[PDB]
Design a protein around this nucleic acid. Structure first.
Lengths: 120, 344, 80, 30, 104, 60, 213, 41, 34
RNA sequence: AUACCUUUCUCGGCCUUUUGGCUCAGAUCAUGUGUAGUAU
RNA sequence: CAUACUUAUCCU
């Protein structure tokens, strides 16, 4: 069928496999933040500052990871609270995945070669 | 008629609010490790399920609040939960693009519905057919054969995430609300929208049917509207604005409408008059941010006397009516009819 | 501001009626035409000049009217 | 006699005009 | 910035996950909260019964060797630890125990 | 840095080599001088005289 | 190896503007003599703008002496509470301590290794240069300017080559998005009849006045 | 302060700026008079 | 002195009050086989 | 030849954006002759 | 003419 119909390479759904797990998280995470952004903006506000809010969320995640307190001087408190709540969502996820992978590493359960480095 | 004419009719004839006893929050349950995102009550009314951002579904005792069971099978957040009334089946959707049928006699996933291109946000079981409906970030309601796992239908037309879903036996058998700010009422035989409702300005994150009336409520960050069925005739806005993104809406048989805000507010409204008799803010459990305070799902138990809320401080909260209240000791927020003359 | 550009839209409205049309122009166009209804859709009898008027009118408006890092800061000294 | 403050060098870098792209030649076109 | 939208001879490629399975539905029988069985009862009676049972039947009511020693009674005053949930990523108790266990 | 021993992690500290030299000389100087003084009694005990098994044996 | 010559301080500062505070091995590459550890140390011990190199207050001296008795020899702790840096705090306390008492075995020997060259002020650029202090500066200038890639250069050249080929073919002679309208969406019918408008559009398309690119 | 795909040079403090006990005395005093009493005795 | 057995937050009992039942459910009552 | 309105020129000024999203800051960061070609 | 760069060319 692939020989005679051709490869159906078109909008069939890709599973979220172990190699896509972290990148799909961030897809979904950003989409969620974008949902919230569009709903938080008042009615006549140019709905294009969302990209800079997403950059602030990236920054706040790196600042969480590095243990750096951030305070953007002119960030609306709604936008900032949204960022804090989603950085905490990622922080919970990442820490729980670290707890889980540590127990597998301790047991000797099968982990990837990069899971050992990522968990360290 | 007009906005002026109709405003005078409204000052004269608006249905007065039916007195409803206040609700109090009597139980917090901690134990999910991420935002609790979905709730579902079992038709027997003795357990509820909550899905989480920690990717699990927990089964809780409805009367003790006790963790009966944790179910792990989703790779990402559980975003929607539906317990079947006709099958011993629970359905979950998740941000992992996956819809799962859990056999509740095995406590195991027996079917998987494959085909959402992005995270799934909403789920609904057809109450009479063995069919389920899911919406997701791919802007599409996928209609599934429960048995064969086949995608029987795709309801196309929304432009952003299908965030809310209703299923009923009469036409329109699917109602969806989307991030594109519209509500589609679908003709399930034809695969086509029978109506597109564009009255909302923000995204419709919550839908709710009236348990007994042929009417549904939709909720935005800007308004809760009430719509008559089949045709989606705008009935009215709630007489106040929760000034919040409403994530969840539940309607009672007494006509208590509970709406839950992304800021953790919980307002209780009179269905039929549109008037909010109660306004609450959540308390977030110790450790939480107060930014991390949303109210992601709410359901009433099957009797209507309990409201279970799924919260962003990772708690389940339970509310009961203070039903030893009487219209004299406990009237709540008091009503002034929509006396204004306004533009609609 | 929609009020600012609204009084500028009324600028344009009264200016262009003062610039392109006259009262006997209007009233004799009407005198030719009794229906000033149910005629919607059918184009009305008006001089072919009118068209370019609009066009010229708006065209009138027209003649009134590292690298990327420089812009960024130029937003900040603007703001900060 | 003159030293090396930053900013002046930054201006020199600006003069080095990056690669803003040269306009396509205006060849006569039939 | 924008997801793929997922609108809908037939192709004869057959997936392994699309082969017949679980080809009949379970329905709720008498005894598994079936709809005709549940109209028959008062669910509010059973809920208030179970809640009262829980809420009452959880309440339960209707010189020596140590004379040169410089410090005495040093455990007294220590806090006994509690079953509590802190909604903090790094300041909860599972995490403090985890880091105590795995970092030496 | 952490050294992963799979059941736990050991912290590993990288000190400036220039400092390391002074620190290792101090380390040797202090242990030599301490031993001369019998600063540490014989109960303190990764002692030089005996491997860890001869310690278990001397305890028996 | 060695103290910082003022050209290096300024390349380090320009790189901190270009690269930020966490790219010390990217910044370390402009400077051939210095490693990322030393660049980081120079920034934090001397070139942090938030370092007060001003003269010492005397509220600050009594803070420093209070602290040096509170947290004795803990200069990394003491230093942020004074507001200075540990080497500033340390030698200021030494100065004040000799002020009370009013070679030395406690000073750098000729040919010894200075422990913290990153705390001392920059040796200024000299009347001359070297191909080290000029090739480094030119590497720095380029690397501070460039954000491009290479194939854009191919781009214009490739198009010119193609244009030349087209010209040659024309001389020798001497989807289709112009037969069809791409995915054509015709305007939907309204209340007004647009037959005449369509004729005019065709006439406009027929026109071929000379127009430059 | 991690990312810069464009390469924009940021002013040194436009980077730094956006997203930025009393018992010690008791202890050191007690320890210092302890040193003193010990030395004198 | 207050150690690094420091408390950072109040309890769920100080937070919610005497009349809110506060449950911490960290393990399931039953196995998957029920 | 002056007072009025009115019309013209010259200063002063401005937002998104071009931000390749994620991870174990993704990781590491650096131990040649000899020729010739070129830049100097 | 002296620093550098290099190239599946050439050795160590």
């Amino acid at each position: 069928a692939r020989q005679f119909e051709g490869r159906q390479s078109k909008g069939i759904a890709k599973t979220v496999t172990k190699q896509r797990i972290e990148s799909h998280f961030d897809l979904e995470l950003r989409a969620a933040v974008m949902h919230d952004i569009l709903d938080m903006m008042p009615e006549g506000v140019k709905q294009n500052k969302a990209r800079t809010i997403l950059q602030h969320l990236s920054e706040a995640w790196r600042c969480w990871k590095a243990n750096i307190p951030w305070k953007v001087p002119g960030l609306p408190a709604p936008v900032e609270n949204m960022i804090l709540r989603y950085v905490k969502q990622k922080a919970d996820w990442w820490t729980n995945v670290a707890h889980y992978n540590r127990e597998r590493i301790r047991r000797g359960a099968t982990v990837d070669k990069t899971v050992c480095r990522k968990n360290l | 008629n007009s906005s002026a004419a109709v405003s005078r009719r409204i000052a004269s004839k608006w249905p007065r609010p039916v007195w409803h006893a206040p609700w109090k929050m009597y139980r917090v349950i901690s134990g999910h490790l991420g935002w609790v995102r979905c709730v579902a009550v079992d038709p027997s009314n003795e357990w509820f399920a909550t899905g989480s951002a920690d990717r699990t579904i927990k089964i809780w005792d409805l009367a003790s609040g006790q963790l009966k069971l944790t179910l792990t099978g989703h790779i990402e957040q559980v975003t929607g939960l539906a317990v079947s009334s006709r099958h011993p089946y629970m359905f979950s959707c998740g941000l992992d693009k996956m819809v799962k049928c859990w056999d509740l006699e095995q406590n195991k996933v027996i079917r998987s519905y494959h085909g959402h291109l992005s995270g799934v946000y909403s789920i609904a079981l057809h109450p009479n057919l063995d069919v389920l409906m899911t919406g997701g970030r791919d802007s599409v309601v996928r209609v599934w054969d429960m048995r064969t796992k086949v995608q029987a239908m795709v309801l196309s037309g929304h432009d952003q995430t299908v965030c809310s879903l209703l299923a009923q036996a009469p036409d329109p058998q699917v109602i969806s609300g989307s991030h594109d700010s519209t509500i589609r009422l679908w003709d399930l035989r034809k695969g086509k929208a029978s109506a597109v409702l564009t009255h909302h300005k923000k995204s419709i994150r919550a839908l709710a049917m009236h348990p007994h009336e042929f009417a549904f409520a939709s909720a935005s960050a800007e308004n809760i509207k009430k719509w008559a069925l089949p045709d989606g005739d705008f009935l009215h806005n709630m007489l106040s604005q929760q000034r919040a993104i409403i994530n969840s809406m539940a309607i009672n048989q007494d006509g208590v409408v509970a709406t839950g805000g992304d800021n953790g507010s919980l307002w209780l409204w009179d269905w039929r008059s549109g008037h909010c008799f109660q306004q609450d803010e959540t308390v977030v459990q110790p450790g939480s941010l107060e930014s991390e305070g949303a109210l992601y799902d709410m359901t009433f138990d099957m009797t209507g006397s309990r409201l279970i809320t799924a919260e962003g401080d990772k708690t389940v909260k339970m509310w009961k009516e203070v039903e030893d209240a009487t219209p004299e000791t406990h009237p709540g927020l008091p009503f002034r009819p929509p006396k204004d003359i306004k533009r609609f | 501001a929609p009020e600012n550009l609204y009084q500028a839209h009324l600028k344009r409205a009264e200016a262009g009626v003062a610039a392109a049309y006259s009262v006997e122009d209007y009233e004799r166009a009407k005198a030719a035409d009794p229906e000033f209804s149910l005629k919607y859709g059918q184009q009305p009898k008006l001089p072919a000049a009118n068209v370019e008027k609009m066009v010229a009118e708006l065209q009138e408006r027209d003649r009134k009217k590292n690298d990327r890092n420089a812009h960024f800061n130029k937003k900040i000294q603007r703001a900060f | 006699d003159k030293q090396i403050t930053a900013e002046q060098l930054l201006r020199e870098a600006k003069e080095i005009q990056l690669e803003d792209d040269y306009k396509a030649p205006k060849q006569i076109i039939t | 910035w924008a997801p793929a939208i997922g609108g809908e001879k037939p192709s004869v490629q057959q997936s392994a996950k699309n082969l017949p399975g679980h080809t009949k539905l379970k329905f709720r029988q008498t005894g598994q909260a079936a709809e005709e069985e549940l109209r028959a009862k008062d669910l509010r009676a059973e809920l208030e019964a179970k809640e009262r049972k829980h809420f009452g039947k959880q309440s339960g009511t209707d010189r020596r060797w140590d004379d040169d020693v410089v410090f005495k009674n040093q455990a007294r005053g220590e806090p006994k630890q509690q079953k509590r949930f802190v909604n903090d990523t790094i300041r909860n108790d599972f995490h403090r125990r985890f880091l105590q266990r795995y970092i030496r | 840095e952490f050294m992963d021993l799979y059941s736990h992690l050991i912290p590993v500290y990288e000190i400036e080599p220039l400092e390391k030299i002074t620190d290792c000389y101090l380390d040797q100087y202090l242990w030599f001088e301490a031993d001369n003084r019998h600063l540490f009694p014989c109960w303190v005990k990764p002692a030089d005289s005996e491997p860890p098994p001869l310690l278990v044996y001397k305890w028996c | 190896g060695g103290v910082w010559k003022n050209t290096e301080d300024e390349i380090l500062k320009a790189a901190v503007m270009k690269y930020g505070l966490n790219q010390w091995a990217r910044i370390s590459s402009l400077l051939v003599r210095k490693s990322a550890k030393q660049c980081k140390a120079r920034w934090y011990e001397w070139l942090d703008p938030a370092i007060k190199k001003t003269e010492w207050t005397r509220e600050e001296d009594e803070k420093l002496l209070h602290l040096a008795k509170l947290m004795p020899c803990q200069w990394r702790t003491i230093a942020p509470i004074v507001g200075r840096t540990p080497a500033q705090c340390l030698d200021r306390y030494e100065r004040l301590l000799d002020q009370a008492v009013a070679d030395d075995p406690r000073r750098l020997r000729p040919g010894e290794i200075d422990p913290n060259p990153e705390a001392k002020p920059a040796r200024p650029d000299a009347v001359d240069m070297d191909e080290d202090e000029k090739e480094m500066l030119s590497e720095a200038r380029a690397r501070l300017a460039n954000t491009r890639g290479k194939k854009a250069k191919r781009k214009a050249r490739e198009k010119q080559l193609e244009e030349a080929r087209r010209l040659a073919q024309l001389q020798k002679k001497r989807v289709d998005y112009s037969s069809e309208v791409a995915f054509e969406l015709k305007p939907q019918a309204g209340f007004y009849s647009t037959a005449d408008e369509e004729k005019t559009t065709r006439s406009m398309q027929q026109e071929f006045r000379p127009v430059t690119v | 302060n991690w990312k810069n795909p464009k390469g924009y040079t940021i002013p040194l403090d436009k980077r730094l700026a956006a997203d930025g006990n009393d018992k010690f005395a008791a202890l050191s005093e007690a320890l210092f008079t302890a040193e003193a009493k010990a030395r004198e005795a | 002195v207050l150690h690094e057995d420091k408390k950072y937050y109040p309890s769920a009992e100080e937070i919610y009050g005497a009349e809110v039942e506060t449950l911490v459910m960290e393990e399931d009552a039953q196995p998957l086989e029920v």
